[PDB]
Amino acid sequence: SMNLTIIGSGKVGLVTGACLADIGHDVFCLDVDQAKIDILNNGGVPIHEPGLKEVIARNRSAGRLRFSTDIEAAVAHGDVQFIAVGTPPDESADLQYVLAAARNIGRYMTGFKVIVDKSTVPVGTAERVRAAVAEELAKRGGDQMFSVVSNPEFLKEGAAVDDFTRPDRIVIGCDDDVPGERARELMKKLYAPFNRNHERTLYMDVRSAEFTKYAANAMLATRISFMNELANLADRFGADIEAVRRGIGSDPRIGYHFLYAGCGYGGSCFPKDVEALIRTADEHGQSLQILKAVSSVNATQKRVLADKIVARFGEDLTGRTFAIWGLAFKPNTDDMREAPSRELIAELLSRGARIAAYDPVAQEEARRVIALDLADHPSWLERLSFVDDEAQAARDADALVIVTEWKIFKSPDFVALGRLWKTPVIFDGRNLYEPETMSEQGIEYHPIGRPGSRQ
Amino acid sequence: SMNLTIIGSGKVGLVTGACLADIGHDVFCLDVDQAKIDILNNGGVPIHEPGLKEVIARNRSAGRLRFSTDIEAAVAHGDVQFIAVGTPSADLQYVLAAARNIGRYMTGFKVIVDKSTVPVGTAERVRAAVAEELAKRGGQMFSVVSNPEFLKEGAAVDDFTRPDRIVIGCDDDVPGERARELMKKLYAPFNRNHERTLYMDVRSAEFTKYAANAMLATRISFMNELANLADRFGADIEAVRRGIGSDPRIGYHFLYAGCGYGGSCFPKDVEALIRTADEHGQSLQILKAVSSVNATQKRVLADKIVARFGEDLTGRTFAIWGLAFKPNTDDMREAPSRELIAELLSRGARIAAYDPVAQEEARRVIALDLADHPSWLERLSFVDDEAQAARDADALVIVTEWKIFKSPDFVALGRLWKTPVIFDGRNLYEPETMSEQGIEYHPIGRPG
Amino acid sequence: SMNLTIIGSGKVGLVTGACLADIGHDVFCLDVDQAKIDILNNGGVPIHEPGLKEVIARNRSAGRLRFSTDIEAAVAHGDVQFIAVGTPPDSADLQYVLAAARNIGRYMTGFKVIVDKSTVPVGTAERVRAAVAEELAKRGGDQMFSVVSNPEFLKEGAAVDDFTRPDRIVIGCDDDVPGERARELMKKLYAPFNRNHERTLYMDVRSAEFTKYAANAMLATRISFMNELANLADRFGADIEAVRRGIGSDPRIGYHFLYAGCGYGGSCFPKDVEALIRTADEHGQSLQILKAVSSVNATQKRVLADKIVARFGEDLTGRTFAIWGLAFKPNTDDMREAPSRELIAELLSRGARIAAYDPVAQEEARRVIALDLADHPSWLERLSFVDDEAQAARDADALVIVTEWKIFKSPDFVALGRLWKTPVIFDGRNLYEPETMSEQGIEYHPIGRPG
Amino acid sequence: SMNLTIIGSGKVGLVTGACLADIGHDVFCLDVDQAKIDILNNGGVPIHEPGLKEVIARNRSAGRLRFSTDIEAAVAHGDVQFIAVGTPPGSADLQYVLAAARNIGRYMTGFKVIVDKSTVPVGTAERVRAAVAEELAKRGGDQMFSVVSNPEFLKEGAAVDDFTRPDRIVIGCDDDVPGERARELMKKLYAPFNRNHERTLYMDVRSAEFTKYAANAMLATRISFMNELANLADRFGADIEAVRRGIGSDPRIGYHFLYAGCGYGGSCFPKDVEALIRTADEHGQSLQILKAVSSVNATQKRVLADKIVARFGEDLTGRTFAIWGLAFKPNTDDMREAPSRELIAELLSRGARIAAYDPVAQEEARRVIALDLADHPSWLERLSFVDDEAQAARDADALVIVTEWKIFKSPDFVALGRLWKTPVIFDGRNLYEPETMSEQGIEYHPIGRPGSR
Ligand SMILES: O=C(O)[C@H]1O[C@H](OP(=O)(O)OP(=O)(O)OC[C@H]2O[C@@H](n3ccc(=O)[nH]c3=O)[C@H](O)[C@@H]2O)[C@H](O)[C@@H](O)[C@@H]1O
Ligand SMILES: O=C(O)[C@H]1O[C@H](OP(=O)(O)OP(=O)(O)OC[C@H]2O[C@@H](n3ccc(=O)[nH]c3=O)[C@H](O)[C@@H]2O)[C@H](O)[C@@H](O)[C@@H]1O
Ligand SMILES: O=C(O)[C@H]1O[C@H](OP(=O)(O)OP(=O)(O)OC[C@H]2O[C@@H](n3ccc(=O)[nH]c3=O)[C@H](O)[C@@H]2O)[C@H](O)[C@@H](O)[C@@H]1O
């Protein structure tokens, strides 16, 4: 059992801190946003993460988990200091809060600290974190040493508590000098309870660990863009992208996962990380061709639903009504960041249509961000409504558009719907239904990468 | 037990036919190259495929496997006719020619199986050709089926008998559903544990084959770009591989950066898919990038070498370990070694190449490659022993990671080369092992 | 989308019915217990299964899931009829299964596919087939059917996850023409579970029936195997946990279910192991390994008392023991065959006072332990249940751990130090690292490790 | 790079020594059998291990691998001393291990790390420690050492692959100062095996010693487990192979080592399972599951004869049986504890003639069966060996398959039909699919499945 400090209280820090406490460590979770800290200390949780509330509560009442804004108390407490603060897009990749945390650790250090970069940060960030802390130690005459370590984060939004407790792997990057080898043993000790069956931890140098995180997200992004290009080609060949998915996923060298063509990828991670890796690379004088292509295919894909709609109803959608099913960038979250629904709704509104959107969870967040998106077009927002019931969105719709494959959308009341829409047309950005089931249900179906039914 | 005909006697047809026989079918293997057929009938095997000779022999002597050039007897024999001929962007002549013959001499209901890798919609052309030759005859029904091939060169017999999956594409009309049942019957012995077979429409089966090879190609090019980025960040591409392969969504396989991909399949298929797409008015951005990264990567060894010894390599000698496009084959098609050796030769160097298996094939293709430069060829030799290549070398270059190169006699070598320098296009050795062995190591995507 | 009927509303039927609905099927869930039906139709859930309430609710409001006691309506509804009723030892009581089978035969319209989901002895599907064919003969029936075996692989307390993301789905069918028809229907029904890897596994019905037993029997064998080695480790002075990692790292053996402790319990392993032994004796064969496995477990359930008696004496009058964990495993409230019951009885019989704690099974335990010990009112007066783990430790001579619920993994050893009489812990689950206990000043008695 | 000595030149020592050299260590391989040493120094290899010859050659010519009978030179050379000598019979014979230990103590210079590689009984490392500390007392020795357990997990005939790409490496060390020093040395030694996943697993020495036996005992249990269920399947009319797929698909159970058949043999499982049972009775505990496991195997080795006698009668005089497979498993020539030996004995004793075939073990089988049957010269005259699988079938009343060598998987059933007396096959390894046999006109008797006629 060790004393750990986590700096930052978002998905990464909140989950990491709570869960490391849950295995018997004494965790101090620090943040500067006093309201966030106040809310946590009053039994609330600022993020939609199944499991997280009960774990936080359990460990607070047990004396293992504390929330505060006391910077000095935080650095005093932990021998291991996790940097888990955010990294906002710039112009790409804003290191200010990370370096600020690093500075404070250097400013008030007593003895040997292990400083862990948990937040997703660009290769070499750990050297800047080391330079910042070594300096604040020079302004103090410090014969106290430290090592910076890379321990990236692999949590999926809305599945973060499971992903943390039952990880595929744990990546640790350490220097092989003497401080580094000391920090390494401490990480070994810290993560022991995760290595009791298969050995889940994976050791490397810090620059490799930093890199790994980006490459991992970049490959997952490539897989998706890959299938999306092929899906648009399938429409031309008359093939079925879903048959092809089973077809190539059955080769264990490729695997079955993340090959789901649709209306593109969004969220707080892929687009940021892909972009950041492309920039870093251009800055080192290298042009990532494949990743550049991957990023371009996605920007295009986010426009595919509008294209299909415009191709079917015309350039001018004045007088049309579209039901939108699903707003969040993926199911089981309320995160609207980079969500395909936002680009879709904008295009449609701009061409004169009325939109009735439904999402089991993201209604509020969507209303907020889409209002900001469209600030310069008040008159568009007047043609956008949110409804409380999936079927209600369909009232007088020329078509229903599915953009996030939430479970409730998989088995709808097609008869109740038949009584509501103007025409039984569905555009499907996630391939939820089997075309010929749609055909027999009398529905004009427009999937992505498969043949439709159109009757 | 059914009677099958296989048309074509290269890797795909030879292995397919022999192996389908070995499970009790009566296989007629047809080809027009009489010499090939003569060789097979005299116990020889025109391809380097472990296992294949014994399987062919076993089944010939058992009366289940026959080789001939008799077109009509072939068509007469098989109720299922596999088209397994070659496809030299994307030349359909031999496939259509086989299709015609089947139409020309058909008796009853045939199931025609496109096994050879062919572009989406090829099965409709094969259907049109055969229906026509049936109209010149007042004709009996048939269905064209897609059943792609997933054999790795040099491991083809294993890959056929214990497949990951079997892909079958059929129409859902009544001929098509009849062909389907026949395929079900034919492949029954492969479905006795897990159900290995996967049914779909024919255009999707055709597509699957290309997408699969294109995804594999992407994974490689992907890691190669990252490898060249690692060199700049000072990261270790191999650590990264472990780092991202441990995510089961990504997987551990085909993430080996190096000097690029080669051979008779990836380059052809990736190019073919790009063309077909442009022809349908779509530009595959990712795949084009993937193809461009590989053309570049095959030049990476030369670049590192020129960066270290200069633009003019006159008076240098390089040892080349590995010629074949990958280990455990003798196939020199699209092999990185060919681009490397050309570049080096063109800048004045002497080359001594070694490969456990491909020496003859390499000598042949490299002579053709460099026909216009006789004087280059005079500076190229092949040797019989890996260490001999090293005699007076300024450096040793590893381009194919055959097993014997994994544990070399670094002392014997030390007695032979001019300077202990190794460029490594496959990342065989651990850098610090090389450092302690006194060796100047240039890996791909790692610190040296 | 098909119309399915599920007969029985316990773990197997409730979860199976709700979850098959959730993928778009129209499910009629039938049971005779009107109170159970009434509770379900009023938004309640008679079992502790995470996920299950929301899935039931979701699908009721969507018109895909219905609960009733109307036998005839149930048979009329489903073309596929799941028998998921219970099978109470005896050894192995088929009455409710046969009774369900009869009703199906009694009111059948057209071709039915009858699916034995409940765990039933090899050849049960022939008895189900005989029962239904007869009721059809009392009716002059030119309607056909096939009986199918589709065993269940749900873990209590993880049943909803286990159903939706299964290792494999086992289907056993005849290869006559009715059977091959039922097979296609099962293929159709289970399609959505085969979209990545092919999860479904076809075989004959007797082999399917058998598989279920052999699967539980092999898991039981692994545990009893490690338990015997654990008691051997105490003699060699080795560490059973080191050995577990030692042999678990061979992929032929694997890492799971090798956790020695105070034995196995619950509503499945003991029943199924016993059943398979009986069936075998009835077929003139003595399963030696399984018999040994069963005997090792009966012994292991006494190990905690033995260790305790060896330390404090044959007469425990004047001693007090804290009991942490009552349920047969963590994350359930099921007290069936729970080691804690044999432990608590032994200890009470020798004069001790017991204070037991469990985060979930308090009520269930109080109920079953009262029945266990009905002949011994005076024993029960020496048994209390407490609401807070630490409270159990008040004046305890030792703390005994019998179910490794997560909250027990990181306890307040100082708070405890202020409460117990002596810092002694007997550990039936190996929760703690011995030398951590040593430095914490604690006299630790694990199973199969040095203390 | 370290200097290592390996004591003993059998599978364990030969492979270990050669392969540790192959990663750059300087290996001295010691043995007392001068002929064995002579054969190795002349490019020969006393064991059937694919890959081994080339590795040995490679490393000899490179100056990293040496074979000798010079005891003192051996002790002088290695700072790490692997005990890899044999452990024969009585249960579990420690004499050669203790003798090696003594020599190490007799001639030690500085700090040695002594590694018990050979499979030895729990607490053997204390006896090795006692023996060496004593020989140091007869010499007045400051010099310290630590005994370490590093068990072996090689499969016979696959030993080179299994060594170089291991599932895990098990190391047991004391946690005193000598022990922690030996631990670091082992960490250093095995580093090149930990560059991807960390393959090495540290524990105390008694647990390491135990691990080795439990691992074999669990593998043995799985097999006997399936064999009992196989015999129960015959009664229920179920298919044991369907059950295998049925329970293998549960990742908690896994797919491996669930092949019912005519039992387990070889130089390891029976020895180790027996040893574990004895040690246990000696510590006053009766291993019930293991005892049953051992009992089920002894019985299974008799199943083929039982099925044959049930079919043709108590008296097999005038019958002839083809035997396909002799080695205890495929890809080896090891006849130890092979099921074929118990089968052939039974059959011969009832008057039958036997024609046996094996692609590799013919010589070794002739030798051991002759010794098994020394007291029955007349039996051996009714036993022949043949060079071609099909020749065994000449006039056979039946063909019996006991080792599932690959060549048996696709036989010339027509060629055979022209040779045997009746088309009858008893299959102790379940090679063929029953209904394929049925259509081929063959009376098939598999283990734990329904047959034909
Ligand atoms: O860096 C991070 O923090 C995390 O980023 C991602 O997680 P996240 O963005 O929350 O969720 P994903 O499940 O990756 O969703 C990505 C987007 O791709 C889309 N997608 C996903 C899969 C697919 O097959 N097709 C597809 O379009 C999803 O709808 C979603 O919009 C990764 O999945 C995590 O492993 C990583 O730790
Ligand atoms: O279409 C076909 O008939 C076959 O082509 C390919 O196989 P192949 O070209 O024989 O050889 P691979 O083993 O795929 O290797 C191709 C190239 O990839 C390179 N490679 C592979 C993996 C890797 O990580 N890095 C890498 O550079 C190899 O050096 C090699 O030159 C596919 O792997 C087969 O599944 C397929 O059936
Ligand atoms: O037939 C059934 O319905 C189910 O029965 C069991 O599930 P369950 O009864 O919930 O309990 P398990 O999780 O199997 O645990 C069995 C007992 O063995 C004990 N055990 C388990 C694992 C172990 O390593 N050691 C050990 O002592 C557990 O504490 C528990 O008391 C099986 O695990 C399921 O696979 C099966 O579907």
Ligand SMILES: O=C(O)[C@H]1O[C@H](OP(=O)(O)OP(=O)(O)OC[C@H]2O[C@@H](n3ccc(=O)[nH]c3=O)[C@H](O)[C@@H]2O)[C@H](O)[C@@H](O)[C@@H]1O
């Ligand atoms: O202690 C040792 O030296 C070695 O002993 C065994 O290896 P081995 O003796 O070569 O034989 P195995 O391949 O393990 O099989 C042994 C016997 O079990 C039989 N077997 C195996 C698996 C199965 O499902 N059924 C079965 O009958 C084999 O046919 C053979 O008779 C162990 O597999 C290795 O872990 C260990 O390193």
